[PDB]
């Protein structure tokens, strides 16, 4: 029983890993990502 509970802890940790991957995917696909603000910063810095 303790082993089938540790396997469930392992699947829980795997679902956490998949969710961290989903959050990274979201931060990289979302519009207002680091790339957008870098472009706007460089562009506005030239204008300024």
């Amino acid at each position: 029983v303790r082993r089938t509970a540790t396997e469930m802890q392992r699947e829980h940790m795997e679902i956490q890993q998949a969710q961290t991957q989903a959050q990274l995917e979201f931060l990289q696909r979302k519009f207002s990502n680091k790339a957008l603000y870098s472009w706007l910063r460089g562009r506005l810095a030239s204008i300024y």
Partner: protein, 49 residues
């Protein structure tokens, strides 16, 4: 998006009035690239101004 269309036309009107009030048509100031689709046209106003 459809407001930047009016703004670029106004800046072009202003450039033409500049060219007609001072006979210097070879020079041009309102240049393209004010709207970038990478940025969904953000900071078009800054470039135009």
């Amino acid at each position: 998006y459809r407001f930047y269309d009016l703004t670029a036309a106004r800046c072009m009107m202003a450039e033409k009035a500049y060219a007609w009030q001072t006979n210097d048509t070879a020079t041009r100031y309102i240049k393209s690239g004010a709207w970038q689709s990478n940025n969904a046209g953000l900071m078009a106003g800054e470039s135009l101004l």
